[PDB]
């Protein structure tokens, strides 16, 4: 996250941190995710596409830091990894960039509720907040586009939803942005998501609930003028989510 503030997981208790195991001993961070129900985490398909071996991923809930432990964290193995059939990548964009991970702990259980582990709410069919709404994003992604390391502490920032008319202007992203995506930016192009933030949440209050409105997907650069961050429009995937989380 470029800008933002450092926070703790109690301020984002639905955030899930996904890592990959390597032969040699290290485990590396892959993407962010969100807890929708006790056994299901939602993230982005491009985070797994090039290495779809579920057995090598670890999911942690209740983590405020990247490589150190947090008291209260829960560790899980990925029982089911559901990618989106029709996921597509082109220059810049990712289409249908949403994925589901069914988690199981070594004792065979799903997440348990605590002050550091909570689910986030799903929007209702095709329902979104109006543009201008401020939403927050969180993650362990880069703090500057030129960095080659991720922060150790979790960060968050506030961004505003912009309209598709504004995002599809030729000098922004043109038609690369579709109706199944959402755009969000800072009025002064100061804070934004960046590499390492993929898969995590875009949360806005909708009908009184803090709702999962988007999934961090792509953006040209990070915090660049006229280059908003693009998110998967969760309200348009509710039938798909339902299809596997039933």
């Amino acid at each position: 996250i470029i800008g933002g503030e450092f926070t703790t997981i109690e301020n984002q208790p639905w955030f899930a941190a996904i890592y990959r195991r390597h032969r040699g001993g290290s485990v590396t961070y892959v993407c962010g995710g969100s807890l929708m129900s006790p056994c299901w985490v939602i993230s982005a398909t491009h985070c797994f596409i090039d290495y779809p071996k579920k057995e090598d991923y670890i999911v942690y809930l209740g983590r405020s830091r990247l490589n150190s432990n947090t008291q209260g964290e829960m560790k899980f193995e990925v029982e089911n990894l559901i990618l989106h059939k029709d996921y597509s990548a082109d220059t810049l964009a990712h289409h249908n960039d949403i994925a589901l991970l069914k988690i199981r702990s070594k004792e065979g259980r799903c997440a348990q509720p605590s002050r550091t582990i909570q689910t986030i709410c799903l929007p209702s069919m095709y329902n979104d907040p109006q543009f201008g709404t401020s939403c927050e994003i969180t993650g362990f992604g880069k703090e500057a586009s030129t960095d080659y390391l991720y922060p150790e502490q979790l960060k968050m920032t506030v961004v505003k939803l912009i309209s598709h008319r504004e995002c599809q202007q030729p000098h922004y992203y043109g038609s690369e942005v579709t109706t199944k995506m959402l755009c969000a930016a800072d009025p002064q192009w100061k804070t934004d998501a960046c590499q390492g933030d993929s898969g995590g949440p875009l949360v806005c209050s909708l009908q009184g609930r803090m709702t999962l409105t988007g999934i961090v997907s792509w953006g040209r650069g990070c915090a660049l003028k006229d280059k908003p961050g693009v998110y998967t429009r969760v309200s348009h995937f509710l039938p798909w989510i339902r299809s596997h989380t039933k």
């Binding site: 639905w14 509720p113 909570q118 986030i120 709410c121």
Partner: peptide, 9 residues
Amino acid sequence: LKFQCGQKT
């Protein structure tokens, strides 16, 4: 206690 989506405590 039990999950209540979107509520932070």
